[PDB]
Each structure stands twice: as structure tokens, then as C-alpha cells.
Write a protein that binds this ligand. Structure first.
Ligand SMILES: CCCc1cc(C(O)(CC)CC)ccc1-c1cc(OCc2ccc(CO)c(CO)c2)ccc1C
Ligand SMILES: CCCc1cc(C(O)(CC)CC)ccc1-c1cc(OCc2ccc(CO)c(CO)c2)ccc1C
Lengths: 239, 11, 239, 11
């Protein structure tokens, strides 16, 4: 068959949102606390992550439907998915060659080593890199990649969610367009969709691992004082 | 009660 | 007369503390969020101020007596005096020539203009600069300057203070050494002491002004999210 | 209850 107007209107709506919240020049990175190669990277990455949360929020506010959800639900979804949207969006700059996140220039190229000095262990970094690679290999389309982020953020199976009905619908509406688009626009994507969901599944484990470690760091004020108000609030455990 | 998240979510 | 051993032991104790918490190279400034000349300076100055709080604390922990006070009293004194210790210590880098704070190099030279873009108004900046100048003119000695900071931090007339007795004593013990030292070691300081106290008095007004403005900014999350955990905690109103 | 201030004040 072929996508409909509605299905398409959504695709253009998401894609526009992403271009508007993801700067390809990375010119904002120069404004973060400088990277330093005892958690010497924590300041710079904290600022990177904080900055990213801001973008993920801006992206969400533009997803059709999300804005009509209750402020409470919006938060529930963000606080539980944000970390995953960041892992998904960071892939856009992940490079298989040097196995790293190459952003602005040389200063903003984060190796597996750099990332180590931010308070996280291989217990997370190993699977994370694994994830980035496997995903980078799916050579998804900008439309598929953008959808996947919207599907992950509109997962009703997140703690704190109230209207576990309306959201379930929205996600369903998104999941179709993806299955459709791939069927129609992505030659050789006969097995893509299924593969993309397995990725939304891996994101839960990463989410899990990061949360444990985040608590550990978060408890030591000499380390939490290095974070940002937004990072503390979103990754915090306040209800 | 999530000061910042609320402010960023409106506008 | 002439200072005693005790009086002197304190002077060397304070002076050593200051040298240990005030880096003359300012090499740490490069690690702050870069300055940008809509509150473009807020990030860099927030980091400057946060960094300074850390130093003021380290300085306090080394003041003879302070460490024996109750953790509660230590906090009461810090939270209420910190902002003043920072205004006093910043004078060490204030330059009468260009009427600015010249720190590291050109990047870390803050004009009256720069400081405007951090969320503060002339309502505070005007008297502040006025203060810095009048004080810079007293050409105090490192021993007098260091004492003055210790006297200001050990002011018992601060909200939250419990042991309003023991502290009153410590401050008294400090105020003498200053009156003595000046009498003995500072030619032409016949009127200095009195002039220095008038400065501890001006610090209360500045403290006052800054607090009002800090609240204003602090209430707007788009601005508070730019601050640091330590700045929020110390300048916050938690009891 | 002033997490950071306490940590910095000890040591
Ligand atoms: C998923 C892990 C996210 C994370 C969390 C933290 C903290 O938990 C530390 C306390 C919070 C600041 C510190 C560092 C990272 C972290 C950040 C990384 O940055 C990828 C980087 C981040 C975000 C984007 C776009 O939003 C891009 C460009 O595509 C690159 C890469 C690897 C890790 C481990
Ligand atoms: C006394 C005013 C202190 C202040 C508070 C704030 C905030 O209130 C803004 C929300 C907190 C970050 C922002 C900027 C400043 C501020 C900071 C200034 O920096 C002086 C600067 C600060 C500190 C030191 C050493 O501790 C030195 C070197 O001697 C220079 C000069 C003028 C102002 C107005």
C-alpha cells in the first residue's frame, strides 16, 4: 500500500522538530564547561547531558499529541525516557571508525576512555557502545530515526504515568507510520521494524544500568555539586 | 515539584 | 606595646589559610563555563562565585576556633557571610585603573558592563564598585585583609546562630589582634581600624541588596537552572 | 539539610 496524508503529516512534523532541536554544527558545545582529558570529564559531560535534556524536551513539546497530555504525564514520560532519548539521539554523531562520538571538532570527540572519567563504568559503557554500533548499522532514515525517538518517549509502560490509555494510543499511531514507512520507503527493511523494537528493549537495560550508577554518584555531594539543576531534577527521584 | 521541567514544558 | 605570641600565631595561621585558598595565577578560571560578552555572563560568574564559595569554606575551616563550633553554627555563619567574604576577597584582584576585576588574563577581566549581564542591576553594582574602591584605597596589609575576612565570618549577629556567646568571643579575639597589629605594624593606621569596621557595615547593605536580587533571579527556573548546586544551597533559604 | 555544605565542612 502507501502511507496516507495523516501518516505523512506526522513524519514531516517529527522531522521538523528534530532539525529544530539538533544542531549539526554543535556550536553550542563551546559554551559547556571545558573537557579535561578523578572525574575530570564530569563537568563537561554533565553540561552536555543537561543541554541534551533541554533539546529532548523541546522535541517532545513538538510531538503531535504529547502537548495535550497532562503536565503530570509529560513529566512522567520525560523523567523516565529522557536518558533513552539521549542515547538514541547521540547516535547521530557516533562514528564506527574511531568508535566514538565525534561532535564539533577534536575537543568534542569523546572516546570510550573520555567517557570513563565521568563517573560511569564499563558495566554501562560496554553495552552502550555495543548499542550505538548495532544501531549505527541499521543505517536508519532520518524519518525512521525520528519516529523511533517519538515511540520511545511515548511508551505508556513507564512509572508515574496516569492516562495509560491515551498515550498507548499515540504510540500505536506512531508505531504504524514506522511499519508503513519502512514497508513502503525502505528497501530491504523487511526485518527493520522488528530490529528497531529490539533496540527499544535494549534501551531499558541501559536505562536501568545508568540509573543505578547515577544514584551512586548522585549520593556523593562532592560529585552531585558538579551536576546541573536540570540534570538533578530530571534524573532525581522526586515524585 | 519539578520547577524547571514545568517552566520548560510550557511556553 | 607589641603583639604577643598568641596574637601572632593567629596572624600566621590566617595568612597561611588565605594563601592556600586564593590562587594568584587564577589558573582554575579556564575550567569555568566560558564568559560571553540576556544574562550571557550568568554561567561564567555563577561558576566563579560557586568556586569562590568553596574557597571561603576552606578558609573558614582553617580559622582557629571555627572548626570547634557546631556544624550548625558553621553553616549559619557561612550561609549569611559567604557573600560578604567573596566581596572582600575579590578586592585582591580589583583594579582602580580600569575600574574592574582583572584576574587571569583578558578573558577574566570583568568590567562593570560584563557584571551587568549576570542578572544584577546598578542598584547593587554601583555600591559594590563604590565599596571595592574605598576599600582598595585603604591599602591594607595581607595580615589586616585576612583578619578582616575572619572578623566578618565570625560575626555572631547573623540569623540562625545558636552559640551567640562563644562566637562573640572569637570575633573579639580577632578584632584585638587587628587593633594591635595596626597600632604596632601599620604606620598611619591611627584611623584604620575604625575605617575597616565601617567596611564591615557596608557589607551588610550589599549583602542585603544582593539577597533581594538573588531571590528574584532564583525564582525564575530558566535562570536558576544556570546556577550551581552549591550556589543554590548556600544562597538558598533552607533552614 | 545542606548536603554539600556538610560534606565540604568535614574532611
Ligand atoms: C546514557 C548515559 C548518559 C551520560 C550520563 C552522565 C551523568 O549520569 C553523570 C552523573 C549525568 C550528567 C554523564 C555522561 C553520559 C554520557 C554522555 C555521552 O554523550 C553522547 C553525546 C550526548 C548527547 C548528544 C545529543 O543529545 C550527542 C550528539 O549526538 C553526543 C556518551 C556516553 C555517556 C556515558
Ligand atoms: C557580591 C555579588 C556576587 C555575585 C553573585 C552572582 C549570583 O548572585 C547570580 C545569580 C550567584 C552566582 C553573580 C555575579 C556576582 C559578581 C561576581 C564578581 O566577581 C568578583 C570575582 C569573584 C570572586 C573572586 C575570589 O572569590 C575574584 C578574585 O579576587 C573576582 C563581581 C561582581 C558581581 C555582581
Amino acid at each position: 500500500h502507501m502511507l496516507s496524508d495523516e501518516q505523512m503529516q506526522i513524519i514531516n512534523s517529527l522531522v521538523e522538530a528534530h532539525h529544530k532541536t539538533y544542531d549539526d554544527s554543535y556550536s553550542d558545545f563551546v559554551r559547556f564547561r571545558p573537557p579535561v582529558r578523578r572525574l575530570s570529564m564530569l563537568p563537561h559531560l554533565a553540561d552536555l547531558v543537561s543541554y541534551s535534556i533541554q533539546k529532548v524536551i523541546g522535541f517532545a513539546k513538538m510531538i503531535p499529541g504529547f502537548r495535550d497530555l497532562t503536565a503530570e504525564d509529560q513529566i512522567a514520560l520525560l523523567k523516565s525516557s529522557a536518558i533513552e532519548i539521549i542515547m538514541l539521539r547521540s547516535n547521530q554523531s557516533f562514528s564506527l571508525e574511531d568508535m566514538s562520538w565525534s561532535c564539533g571538532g577534536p575537543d568534542f570527540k569523546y572516546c570510550i576512555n573520555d567517557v570513563t572519567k565521568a563517573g560511569h563504568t564499563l558495566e554501562l559503557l560496554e553495552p552502550l557502545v555495543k548499542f550505538q554500533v548495532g544501531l549505527k548499522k541499521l543505517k536508519l532514515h532520518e524519518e525512521e530515526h525520528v519516529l523511533l525517538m517519538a515511540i520511545c518517549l511515548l511508551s505508556p509502560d513507564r512509572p508515574g504515568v496516569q492516562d495509560h490509555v491515551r498515550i498507548e494510543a499515540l504510540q500505536d499511531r506512531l508505531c504504524d507510520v514506522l511499519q508503513a514507512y519502512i514497508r513502503i520507503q525502505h528497501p530491504g527493511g523487511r526485518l527493520l521494524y522488528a530490529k528497531m523494537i529490539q533496540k527499544l528493549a535494549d534501551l531499558r537495560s541501559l536505562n536501568e544500568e545508568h540509573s543505578k550508577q547515577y544514584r551512586s554518584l548522585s549520593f556523593q555531594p562532592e560529585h552531585s555539586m558538579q551536576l546541573t539543576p536540570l540534570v538533578l531534577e530530571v534524573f532525581g527521584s522526586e515524585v | 515539584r519539578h520547577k524547571i521541567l514545568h517552566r520548560l514544558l510550557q511556553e
